[PDB]
Structure 1
Amino acid sequence: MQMAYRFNGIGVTQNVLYENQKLIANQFNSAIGKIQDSLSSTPSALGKLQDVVNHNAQALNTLVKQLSSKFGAISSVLNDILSRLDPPEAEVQIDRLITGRLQSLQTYVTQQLIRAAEIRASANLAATKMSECVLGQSKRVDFCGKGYHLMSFPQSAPHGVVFLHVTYVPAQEKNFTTAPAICHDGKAHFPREGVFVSNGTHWFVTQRNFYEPQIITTDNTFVSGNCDVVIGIVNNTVYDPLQPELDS
């Protein structure tokens, strides 16, 4: 029933769900099954988290390497700069080492601050995606997966979150002849929801997202104007449900 809620949300009537409940359940189950196989693939789609981990490790290792660097001094060793040189020259050598290593620390902290800003941007995006994809149904286009968003599921991952976006994708299009409106008695009828289509001889009114034709009546259409101003209006007959019941 909440799947019917969500189908109504994306613009499809809920009888489409109720009449295809087992087909939709099977499609969802097959897609969920294929997700696990897709993740366990050679591209290793878990690239962002691995890149974050590798960047952190590389920064730490570079900071470690910067210790064993003379920075223009006699040597990078702690005691060997004092057990050999005199206190006066050892003073400037220690100054050289201190400036170099504190510069390394400052550079590392600056890079970490920039990377933390980037990670905070990503985390804010993930938070809004959790709020709008998971805690609700999003009408934003391509925000929550590709297609008409139906729902979403979160999955924790090391230093990240994985969203499984369930979306509704149209599959088998058919071409029809359409019309902005139709005429019955010098009146112009526009569809309340859906569009007017023709299979070649008859005219029906469907919903815009799924081909479910219905007979054009005074319940699916509303009248506004006449057959004078609408460019492309087509003659037809508009069934009145009141006539058979009143005559009988």
Structure 2
Amino acid sequence: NQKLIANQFNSAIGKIQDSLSSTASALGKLQDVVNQNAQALNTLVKQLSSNFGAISSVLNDILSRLDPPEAEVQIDRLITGRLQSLQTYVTQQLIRAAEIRASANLAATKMSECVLGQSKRVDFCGKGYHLMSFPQSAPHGVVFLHVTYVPAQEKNFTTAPAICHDGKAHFPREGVFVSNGTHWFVTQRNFYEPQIITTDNTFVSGNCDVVIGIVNNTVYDPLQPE
């Protein structure tokens, strides 16, 4: 199915390109970090116009209006008010930095396990069965493009756990037994591709009266004329 598979891949890459060049914004997680940090710095700058109980929020016109005995009384009020706001800024910056570090650790784990390998962890590298991934850089961030396999167009059948042939129970090597209504086949689990039940694709274990739900059929022996 190589040509079909290549064309489906090329169409999906084109749709990524379309839903980014359209103005439906998706880089919200990156814009939030920028907005929060700009807002914190604006609050720290606007706290310099508060007088904190003193006669003026400007320091030059305390020093130009008063004498050194009662200028220190007014300067101590501004000093405590400005230390408290620097202290609050620094504490919330330390709390945000730890969250950004945990996000960067997750991104480094995903670069190791989705780009440099194939992963069996469910939903770690996208939704579906993971095939491969590609990194792309972003401002203060990273974008992963995950490629997955999704099954489509399912169909009903009748199944059985084992087949009885000569007083012996037969089990699939790798697959399931299915029936189209009249005949019995064996197929692999994730894609319908029915084959004849022979002794090359089954194994045998015990007699056929322990299994709940065993079915009578014929198991074919491929060295027939001898």
Which residue number in structure 2 is paired with residue 30 of structure 1?
11
Between stretches 46-55 and 59-68, larger displacement belongs to 59-68
CA-to-partner distance for each residue in 1:39-60, whole Å, 9 max, x for gaps? 2344411111111111111111
User: Which of 152-161 and 31-40 deviates more?
Assistant: 31-40
Q: Which moved more, 1:156-165 or 1:236-245?
A: 236-245
Which region of structure 1 is more displaced relative to structure 2, 95-104 or 163-172? Answer: 95-104
Could you tell me how far apart the structure 2 residues matched to 1:212 and 1:59 are? 61
Secondary structure in 1 aligned to 2:185? strand
Q: Which residue of 1 aligns with 2:68?
A: 87
In structure 1, C-alpha distance between the alignment counterparts of 2:71 and 2:207, rounded to whole Å:
100
Equivalents in 2 of 1:81, 1:244: separation in Å? 114
Q: Which residue of 2 aligns with 1:194?
A: 175
Counterpart-to-counterpart distance in 1, 2:225 and 2:98: 70
With the length of structure 2 as denominator, give the TM-score of the two structures. 0.95
Q: Equivalents in 1 of 2:100, 2:29: separation in Å?
A: 11
* Cα shift readout 1:158-207 (whole Å, capped 9, x = no counterpart): 00000000000011111111111111111111111121111111111111
Q: How many Å apart are 1:104 and its aligned residue?
A: 1.2
CA-CA distance at 1:72 after TM superposition: 2.2
Q: Which runs of 5+ in 2 are unaligned?
A: none
SS of equivalent to 1:152: strand
TM-score by length of 1: 0.87
Over residues 74-100 of structure 1, what are the superposed CA-to-partner deviations in whole Å (9 max), with x where a residue is unaligned? 221120122123323321322221222
- Residues 1:110 and 1:243: Cα distance change in structure 2 (over 3 Å): same
Counterpart CA distance in 2 for 1:225 and 1:65 is: 84
User: Is there any run of 5+ residues in structure 1 with no aligned partner, and where?
Assistant: 1-19
Separation in structure 1 between the aligned mates of residue 203 and residue 157 of structure 2, nearest angstrom:
22
Residue by residue, what CA displacement relative to the aligned partner does 1:9-68 show, whole Å, maximum 9, x if unpaired? Answer: xxxxxxxxxxx0000000000001101112234441111111111111111111111111
- Could you say what secondary structure the match of 1:178 adopts? strand
The percent identity for this pair of structures is: 99
Tell me: CA distance 1:196–1:113, structure 2 relative to 1, closer, same or farther (3 Å).
Answer: same
Which stretch shows the higher mean deviation, 84-93 or 202-211? 84-93
Runs of 4 or more consecutive aligned structure 1 residues displaced over 6 Å after TM superposition: none
Deviation (angstroms), 1:152? 0.4
Which residue of the other structure, out of 145, 154, 161, is the alignment partner of 2:135?
Answer: 154
Q: What is the alpha-carbon distance in structure 1 between the residues aligned to residue 38 and residue 159 of structure 2?
A: 61
Deviates more, 1:25-34 or 1:192-201: 192-201
Aligned length: 226
CA distance in 2, matches of 1:223, 1:74: 97
Rate the CA distance shift 1:229–1:72 in 2: closer, same or farther, 3 A. Answer: farther
In the other structure, the counterpart of 2:98 is 117
Secondary structure (helix, strand or coil) at the match of 1:218 reads coil
Question: How far apart are residue 141 of structure 1 and its match?
Answer: 0.3
Cα shift at 1:228: 1.2
Equivalent-residue separation in structure 2 for 1:225 and 1:78 (angstroms): 96
How far did 1:244 drift?
4.4
- Provide the aligned C-alpha RMSD in A: 1.3
Please say which of residues 60-69 and 85-94 is displaced more in the overlay.
85-94
Instruction: Give the Cα–Cα distance (whole angstroms) in 1 for the partners of residues 173 and 220 of structure 2.
Output: 15
